[PDB]
């Protein structure tokens, strides 16, 4: 309907598909009520929108959350002690396409790699310990 905030889109009342995850477990709201039609940046939700989709959005998080990790986490220990791309690869075995792969999840198939980042994470020497 406008939007004088940034003069994009049109923050209009619309439900669509809101696809929450688009590399595994792609979970889409099909039913996010709020402003949207053409813009994905200036929305708008109430309460009932809000809950509706924070409610699914949530609710696959945790369902999905029951994995062994998240994307976020393995990448952050991997930037948090700076373990190069090569470090990694000969202290864990991250390998080549380690961190996309990763990313989306589909090079973490729960192996020593993640018992040994999320151990890292609090020892930033253990890699040298280990290795």
């Given at each position: 309907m406008k939007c004088p905030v940034c003069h994009q889109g049109e923050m209009v009342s619309g439900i669509k598909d809101i696809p929450y995850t688009f590399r595994g477990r792609k979970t889409v709201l099909k039913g996010i009520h709020g402003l949207y039609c053409v813009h994905c940046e200036e929305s708008i939700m109430n309460?009932?929108?809000?809950?509706?989709?924070?409610?699914?959005?949530?609710?696959?998080?945790?369902?999905?959350?029951?994995?062994?990790?998240?994307?976020?986490?393995?990448?952050?220990?991997?930037?948090?002690?700076?373990?190069?791309?090569?470090?990694?690869?000969?202290?864990?075995?991250?390998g080549v396409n380690a961190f996309s792969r990763y990313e989306k999840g589909n090079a973490q198939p729960h192996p020593s790699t993640i018992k040994l980042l999320r151990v890292l994470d609090k020892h930033p020497?253990?890699?040298?310990?280990i290795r």
């Open positions: 309460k009932e929108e809000s809950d509706a989709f924070m409610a699914q959005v949530k609710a696959f998080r945790a369902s999905v959350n029951a994995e062994t990790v998240a994307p976020e986490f393995i990448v952050k220990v991997r930037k948090k002690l700076s373990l190069t791309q090569k470090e990694a690869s000969e202290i864990f075995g991250g020497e253990l890699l040298n310990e």
